[PDB]
Amino acid sequence: XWXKXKXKXWX
Amino acid sequence: XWXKXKXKXWX
Amino acid sequence: XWXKXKXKXWX
Amino acid sequence: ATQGVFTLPANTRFGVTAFANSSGTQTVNVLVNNETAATFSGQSTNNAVIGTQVLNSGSSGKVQVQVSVNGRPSDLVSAQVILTNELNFALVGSEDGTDNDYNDAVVVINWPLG
Amino acid sequence: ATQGVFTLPANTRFGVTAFANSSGTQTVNVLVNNETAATFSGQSTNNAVIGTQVLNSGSSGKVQVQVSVNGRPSDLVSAQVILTNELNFALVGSEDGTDNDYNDAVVVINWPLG
Amino acid sequence: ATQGVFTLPANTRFGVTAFANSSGTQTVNVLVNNETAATFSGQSTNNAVIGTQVLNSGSSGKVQVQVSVNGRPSDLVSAQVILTNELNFALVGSEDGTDNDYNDAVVVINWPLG
Amino acid sequence: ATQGVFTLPANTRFGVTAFANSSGTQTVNVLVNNETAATFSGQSTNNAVIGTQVLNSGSSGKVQVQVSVNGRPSDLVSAQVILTNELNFALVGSEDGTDNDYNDAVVVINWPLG
Ligand SMILES: *C(=O)C[C@@H]1O[C@@H](C)[C@@H](O)[C@@H](O)[C@@H]1O
Ligand SMILES: *C(=O)C[C@@H]1O[C@@H](C)[C@@H](O)[C@@H](O)[C@@H]1O
Ligand SMILES: *C(=O)C[C@@H]1O[C@@H](C)[C@@H](O)[C@@H](O)[C@@H]1O
Ligand SMILES: *Cc1ccccc1C*
Ligand SMILES: *Cc1ccccc1C*
Ligand SMILES: *Cc1ccccc1C*
Ligand SMILES: [Ca+2]
Ligand SMILES: [Ca+2]
Ligand SMILES: [Ca+2]
Ligand SMILES: [Ca+2]
Ligand SMILES: [Ca+2]
Numbered sequence: 001x002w003x004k005x006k007x008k009x010w011x
Numbered sequence: 012x013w014x015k016x017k018x019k020x021w022x
Numbered sequence: 023x024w025x026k027x028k029x030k031x032w033x
Numbered sequence: 034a035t036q037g038v039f040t041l042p043a044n045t046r047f048g049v050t051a052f053a054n055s056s057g058t059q060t061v062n063v064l065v066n067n068e069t070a071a072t073f074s075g076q077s078t079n080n081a082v083i084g085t086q087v088l089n090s091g092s093s094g095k096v097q098v099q100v101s102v103n104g105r106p107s108d109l110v111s112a113q114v115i116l117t118n119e120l121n122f123a124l125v126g127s128e129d130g131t132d133n134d135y136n137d138a139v140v141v142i143n144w145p146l147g
Numbered sequence: 148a149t150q151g152v153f154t155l156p157a158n159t160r161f162g163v164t165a166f167a168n169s170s171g172t173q174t175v176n177v178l179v180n181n182e183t184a185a186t187f188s189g190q191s192t193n194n195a196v197i198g199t200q201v202l203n204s205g206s207s208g209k210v211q212v213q214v215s216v217n218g219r220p221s222d223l224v225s226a227q228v229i230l231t232n233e234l235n236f237a238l239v240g241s242e243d244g245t246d247n248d249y250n251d252a253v254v255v256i257n258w259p260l261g
Numbered sequence: 262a263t264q265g266v267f268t269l270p271a272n273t274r275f276g277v278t279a280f281a282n283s284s285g286t287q288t289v290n291v292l293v294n295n296e297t298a299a300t301f302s303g304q305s306t307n308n309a310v311i312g313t314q315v316l317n318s319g320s321s322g323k324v325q326v327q328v329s330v331n332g333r334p335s336d337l338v339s340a341q342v343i344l345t346n347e348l349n350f351a352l353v354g355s356e357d358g359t360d361n362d363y364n365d366a367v368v369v370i371n372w373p374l375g
Numbered sequence: 376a377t378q379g380v381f382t383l384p385a386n387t388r389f390g391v392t393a394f395a396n397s398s399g400t401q402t403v404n405v406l407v408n409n410e411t412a413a414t415f416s417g418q419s420t421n422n423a424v425i426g427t428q429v430l431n432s433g434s435s436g437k438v439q440v441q442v443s444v445n446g447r448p449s450d451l452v453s454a455q456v457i458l459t460n461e462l463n464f465a466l467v468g469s470e471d472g473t474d475n476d477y478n479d480a481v482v483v484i485n486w487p488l489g
């Protein structure tokens with residue numbers, strides 16, 4: 001996804 | 012497990 | 023490969 | 034190559050368990066003889082179990098795992114491993130994005146049970 | 148040969164899950180760097196999940212699975228499988244009796260998470 | 262647990278290949294239906310292929326690999342892996358000594374052929 | 376998912392061996408750190424060994440297997456299996472046509488050696 005780390009915070 | 016029945020074998 | 027005798031039927 | 038398709042012994046009970054590791058909600062469908070037999074859905078980035086069930090492999094033995102996120106099929110990877118000629122695992126990973134960790138839904142099938 | 152011991156990448160979160168298929172109550176101990184880090188117990192002949200947890204492999208990466216029933220260690224079988232060079236499974240079966248199905252406690256370790 | 266025993270589909274041709282990685286001469290016996298069907302013998306510390314042969318799994322499908330050095334049975338480890346629900350590997354390692362590299366004889370069985 | 380790519384321990388000697396089961400001549404390329412390190416060529420429908428070689432995984436540890444038949448890339452399937460936390464196999468099957476036996480070239484990588 002989008003945001004932090006491996007892709008956390010959106011969706 | 013213990014005793015007789017399905018899968019019980021020597022136990 | 024093509025034709026007969028190369029595996030099982032077509033191909 | 035095709036992935037997520039396994040031939041089990043016919044008429045045999047097996048376990049199927051799915052874990053999630055993704056921002057996206059995972060939908061895991063398990064087909065037996067080409068018909069849906071179980072569906073799990075859930076979201077986790079911490080390996081939560083989103084479903085576990087015991088199914089019967091039926092007359093054909095054919096079991097297929099499909100994974101999708103928001104209706105888009107994930108790319109699958111899979112293999113079967115047998116230990117001491119007795120204990121079977123059919124393993125599926127899936128990728129819903131671009132990082133290629135293949136853990137976005139992880140599905141473990143195991144048999145025999147009991 | 149030793150079974151149930153795996154070297155994970157160090158400092159890595161991993162999942163560990165155990166399933167039971169036996170009349171005997173299973174206790175699964177998970178050791179990280181030779182120290183108990185998780186313990187699951189339960190009884191099922193229907194593949195119930197007796198525990199699932201996220202752990203960290205620590206500075207050594209050494210993870211060991213032990214299974215016992217009534218204080219007697221079960222005989223273990225294990226292997227690690229890696230799919231698409233990314234997705235890892237460390238697999239354990241165990242036998243508490245004489246039928247040699249090796250499913251009495253089945254333990255699956257998976258990484259990476261997230 | 263028993264190691265080096267595999268149930269193949271019956272009446273099926275399969276390949277068996279042995280590699281050596283030890284100071285000692287490895288004797289690899291391949292039994293089909295409990296009768297010796299092939300024997301390889303050789304010494305290498307460089308992974309040399311000491312033999313390869315195509316056999317038939319016979320009416321039972323039971324294939325067993327035994328490894329010895331000068332008549333002394335080595336300790337075996339084994340597993341079967343199946344890729345894309347089609348391609349089968351039965352894998353054996355063996356240890357003749359104390360270093361536990363388990364590569365002293367490595368045996369790979371593969372099927373189907375052709 | 377990418378197949379035929381394996382991360383080995385760096386700077387480590389490993390065996391690579393290829394078998395053929397196809398009407399077409401198989402070309403097996405092994406790349407180490409993105410540079411060709413071995414090429415085998417041969418033809419068999421009966422599992423003949425078309426090549427075996429010990430290679431060094433180099434500073435990256437990256438090993439990639441490619442298979443082609445008269446230039447055309449075959450579709451690959453692969454996995455890595457580790458026994459007793461020591462003995463490693465990286466396994467590749469390949470399909471040069473449509474029948475999906477995935478045995479047309481079979482490639483086995485194994486380590487450690489010696
Ligand atoms: C974006 O949603 C990508 C998605 O979720 C991330 C948290 C990470 O698990 C990634 O592997 C996954 O594809
Ligand atoms: C004791 O009964 C044996 C035990 O439980 C059985 C039901 C079966 O699961 C067997 O495999 C297990 O060892
Ligand atoms: C044609 O070359 C197809 C090819 O060879 C056949 C003999 C069979 O081995 C098939 O699996 C392979 O793709
Ligand atoms: C960023 C993201 C992740 C998962 C599902 C949907 C969206 C927009
Ligand atoms: C039920 C049980 C547990 C441990 C060892 C033996 C038996 C029969
Ligand atoms: C032999 C072959 C090669 C590529 C595609 C199809 C066929 C039959
Ligand atoms: Ca992902
Ligand atoms: Ca993920
Ligand atoms: Ca048992
Ligand atoms: Ca059992
Ligand atoms: Ca040794």
Ligand SMILES: [Ca+2]
Binds near residue numbers: 365
């Ligand atoms: Ca050795």
Ligand SMILES: [Ca+2]
Binds near residue numbers: 472474475477478479
């Ligand atoms: Ca083919």
Ligand SMILES: [Ca+2]
Binds near residue numbers: 374396397479
């Ligand atoms: Ca073929």
